[PDB]
């Protein structure tokens, strides 16, 4: 009905609305992203989470409630908007889930240094190429301080930082204020399967195959 340019802008906006809804409601279960599928007379939203059984509930009661919420937001024909929640593997290789676990650990009350070190160890052993946790705020003092815990090695400039680097910025409400966690995870270029296969500067040399000389006059008679 609406012109296509405004319709796609509204599609992106609605993506952002439901993404905020899922990030704000689906935090405790480690929400880490969505995938919206487009098809004539049917829209599908894939919710990649970790605690997917504890999202689905009994016979998908909660996910059915969520897709009904979206359906009533859009006033679309019931059943057109469908939701499916899947257990995304390697929950450690996701900035959103790692920052959410940081938030939960901090609110639980574990010391910030040990928390950051635990998350960075988990991220490192989970196969991540590089990790960086920046915690900003009041840390055992009344003046703001920032602690940066890094491992591996990341990048900051170019397109590779745009694509490989997954970033999550979370504002944890603590007792004396708000702390800020910036989790920056560099992933593997050869673990994308989309776009560039490797870093634009890191070259891989091809394996040669040696061939023996002739050493003698032979004639292939046929």
């Amino acid at each position: 009905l609406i012109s296509k340019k405004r319709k796609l802008v509204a599609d992106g906006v609605f993506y952002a609305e439901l993404n905020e809804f899922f990030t704000r409601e689906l935090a405790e279960e480690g929400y880490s992203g969505v995938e919206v599928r487009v098809t004539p007379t049917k829209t599908e939203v894939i919710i990649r989470a970790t605690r997917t059984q504890d999202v689905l509930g009994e016979n998908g009661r909660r996910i059915n409630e969520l897709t009904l919420l979206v359906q009533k937001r859009f006033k679309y024909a019931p059943g057109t908007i469908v939701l499916y929640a899947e257990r995304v593997q390697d929950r450690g290789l996701s900035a959103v889930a790692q920052a959410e676990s940081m938030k939960f650990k901090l609110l639980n009350g574990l010391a910030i240094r040990r928390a950051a070190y635990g998350v960075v160890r988990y991220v490192m052993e989970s196969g991540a190429k590089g990790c960086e946790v920046v915690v900003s705020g009041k840390l055992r003092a009344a003046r703001a301080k920032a602690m940066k815990f890094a491992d591996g090695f990341l990048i900051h400039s170019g397109q590779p930082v745009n694509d490989f680097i997954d970033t999550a910025t979370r504002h944890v409400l603590m007792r004396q204020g708000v702390l800020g966690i910036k989790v920056k995870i560099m992933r593997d270029p050869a673990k994308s399967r989309t776009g560039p296969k490797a870093l634009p500067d890191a070259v891989t040399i091809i394996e040669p195959k040696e061939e023996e000389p002739i050493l003698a006059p032979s004639v292939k008679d046929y």
């Binding site: 296509k4 340019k5 796609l8 802008v9 995938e35 599928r37 487009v38 098809t39 004539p40």
Partner: protein, 100 residues
């Protein structure tokens, strides 16, 4: 009948593979068809100040969203028309059906 499929997506890779599989299946099915007419790419620009408040140098940024629109005009029986329309459906790419 003169049906027409037009697609108005934003992701060029999905756009191109949709077009490629459509034209390749049409060619392997040995029909009569018109080539994919490829309208100019429309770039939506939004120019805004980087700063939330008014302090600092007067620096600006431009966020661009690229829109790719292609279309194909066909004439065929209804059954195979619906078959071609409904197969090879991909998320992110929006397609619609028109006449003449």
């Amino acid at each position: 009948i003169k049906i027409r499929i037009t697609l108005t997506s934003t992701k060029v890779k999905q756009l191109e593979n949709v077009s490629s599989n459509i034209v390749k299946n049409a060619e392997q099915h040995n029909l009569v068809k018109k080539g994919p007419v490829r309208l100019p790419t429309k770039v939506l620009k939004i120019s805004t100040r980087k700063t939330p408040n008014g302090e600092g140098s007067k620096t600006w940024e431009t966020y661009e969203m690229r829109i790719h629109k292609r279309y194909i005009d066909l004439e065929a029986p209804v059954q195979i028309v619906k078959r071609i329309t409904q197969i090879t459906i991909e998320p992110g790419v929006d397609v619609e059906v028109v006449v003449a």
